[PDB]
Design a protein around this ligand. Structure first.
Ligand code: L7N
Ligand code: OJQ
Ligand code: CA
Ligand code: CL
Ligand code: CL
Lengths: 371, 371
């Protein structure tokens, strides 16, 4: 293969088991939206469920229907629904639906009537993120409509959910504030005669660093893939599951003073050897990594030199060579063999590892190492 | 949810513009990287129908996909990993550009196994120093090619090279590369080796340095309507890709309320927001957060707060609400309606429109407007 994103499913399993320890008695909902954060929703889902995950979480019904079509029968919740969505197929596929407005519930209820299928409903309430979540003023009317729907067996009231404002800052008081708001929302449900089976607020960071804020379920995403939910604390006993690597497509000598890639942005101070790596920014190698990233080849860090092109870039191998055409170069991974990490790319680019692992594509073929 | 709508009428227009600038020269439309994100097969079909004579791609794999999709026009591939079996290319009538003596031997080995004449182009280094045959090795290559031609093992179709900095067309390096390219043609003429065609020109050279046009031009970026010399304006081209999405939610917020992760934006005034259900896993670069604008019903609306994995918020302002759920937000396009361009994104995060248009993916479904 020209290049591959190898997902280690034994790393996934290990990370799920680590997360279950932090979750204690709370059930684990593994978040596999965005094609398993670029790792493959179905294969990751299967591994996580086998490692103790109780439920799966995705953004869209389409993501849940994809898992169902691959044979997944475990519970799946979807919480982002565009205007015009037909909830019918979700109901027929035993997909759980989180509603974030009265309009969305009314749309779900029309789908229940059309399909004859009771909806397993979760309500997504806003505790601070201010995105798609029922606002505090609208929550009582939401409870009222849910109770009436429940009283006619049109819905099963499964969940109350919300999402944390900080994905990596557990010490910030907004975490405590959101957990208090969530508790007051649960008290509002009580005064309106409504009980949810379960309530959940916690992402990877809250699960691992704020276990005092854990409700009935936890919803880890980033930590399942092994990426630290609080990078300032280290790897947190997790193992990043994705290793991006590619073959050395060409070894080229150059003389001191010669330029490389478009605009000749880098000149050779000494006679040396370069390796052409046949992936580039169309494959998810951020162009802004040019002249900053390093790759690991046969145990040594080799710096990128010159601009990253659409499907290739060059690294400096130095001046006799221990690298051959066809040898493997590691761009990032868990860091076990001394290679860069997804967090290293995030630091160089000014982003987060979430964006790094959803980047590889095109020439970078996704592959799996079994547990 | 969202789409990258490719206007094939724009493609047709751009190909016509490029043929006008190419004058007598035929056009090889460059459709690598799945048509720079616009769809290699659909763009190739359209470009051929507007008078492109040939197609260019990086890999044989890319060429074989075009062939599998029913493309019968000539296709040239110019980036091959070491140890490739050129058999499949030869059987599928894929032209092969060789960039080293070793690669030519790989090709002639495949000619011997298959019994099919190779239609060969020689890719020569005139200063890019990426791949390409150097002047030191070119005389030996000509001697070998003359011997393969004699036995009909190769048809000597093309000589090619690639410009280092043609988007700075006044730079002398362009003249220098063309003179080196001429020296290669001269070296072949004096050694009694004749190529059917020679081509040096990318989009920039084609549009801005017609004095450097040989027998063919090889435009990629301009076929997609993206300016090959941004500083000169649109150069009479029309960007073919419009990235747009449905407004998923409209909501009011109060002054002092934070939005999105980390509350990195605090509302300075009561205002209305729109939730746009695409994010960095869909190619909306996270670094655009708080910098980009979208167009909704003729008005520019700034992004506010962090861009999330699959959604971000825009500020509709406190004026009369003129946006509804279900309305269309344009992220970038040609600019005909006042929307931002791909170049605008490139300016904002410090890249080039090439990378912008190879980014949209995920929830951003590729769609086509017929000519
Ligand atoms: C409702 C809900 N519950 C749990 C998770 C999982 O959160 P993480 O454990 O931090 O991966 C997410 C994911 N949110 C993505 C991550 O990137 N930006 C986002 O908007 C989520 O929307
Ligand atoms: C041999 C050859 N010939 C023509 C074109 C067309 O280049 P353009 O007209 O600028 O789109 C390209 C593509 N040059 C690149 C731009 O970004 N990454 C690249 O590798 C090419 O490699
Ligand atoms: Ca409308
Ligand atoms: Cl390439
Ligand atoms: Cl989302």
């Amino acid at each position: 293969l020209l290049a591959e994103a190898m997902v280690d499913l034994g790393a996934i399993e290990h990370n799920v088991r680590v997360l279950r320890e932090h979750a204690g008695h709370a059930q684990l909902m593994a978040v596999v939206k965005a094609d398993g954060y670029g790792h493959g929703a179905t294969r990751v889902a299967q591994t996580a469920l086998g490692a103790g995950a109780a439920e799966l979480g995705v953004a869209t019904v389409d993501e849940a229907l994809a898992l169902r079509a691959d044979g997944i029968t475990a519970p799946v919740l979807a919480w982002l629904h565009p205007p015009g969505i037909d909830f019918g197929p979700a109901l027929l596929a035993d997909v759980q639906v989180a509603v974030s407005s009265l309009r969305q519930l009314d749309e779900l209820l029309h789908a229940v009537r059309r399909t004859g299928r009771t909806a397993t409903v979760t309500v997504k309430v806003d505790t601070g993120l201010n995105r798609n979540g029922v606002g505090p003023a609208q929550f009582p009317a939401m409870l009222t409509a849910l109770r009436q729907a429940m009283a006619e067996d049109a819905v099963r009231l499964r969940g109350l959910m919300s999402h944390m404002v900080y994905a990596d800052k557990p010490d910030d008081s907004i975490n405590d504030v959101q957990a208090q708001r969530f508790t007051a929302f649960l008290a509002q449900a009580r005064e309106q005669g409504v009980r949810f089976e379960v309530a959940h607020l916690s992402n990877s960071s809250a699960t691992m660093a704020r276990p005092d804020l854990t409700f009935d379920l936890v919803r880890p995403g980033i930590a399942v893939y092994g990426l630290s939910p609080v990078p300032a604390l280290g790897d947190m006993g997790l193992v990043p599951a994705m290793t991006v690597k590619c073959a050395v497509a060409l070894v080229k000598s150059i003389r001191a003073g010669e330029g490389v890639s478009y605009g000749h942005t880098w000149i050779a101070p000494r006679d040396t050897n370069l390796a052409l790596l046949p992936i580039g920014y169309a494959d998810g190698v951020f162009r802004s990594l040019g002249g900053r990233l390093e790759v690991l080849i046969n145990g040594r860090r080799c710096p990128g030199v010159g601009r990253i092109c659409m499907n290739q870039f060059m690294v400096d191998l130095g001046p006799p060579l221990d690298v051959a055409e066809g040898d493997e170069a590691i761009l990032f991974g868990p860091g076990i063999r001394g290679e860069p990490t997804a967090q290293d790319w995030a630091d160089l680019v000014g982003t987060i590892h979430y964006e790094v692992v959803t980047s590889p594509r095109g020439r970078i073929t996704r592959t799996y190492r079994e547990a």
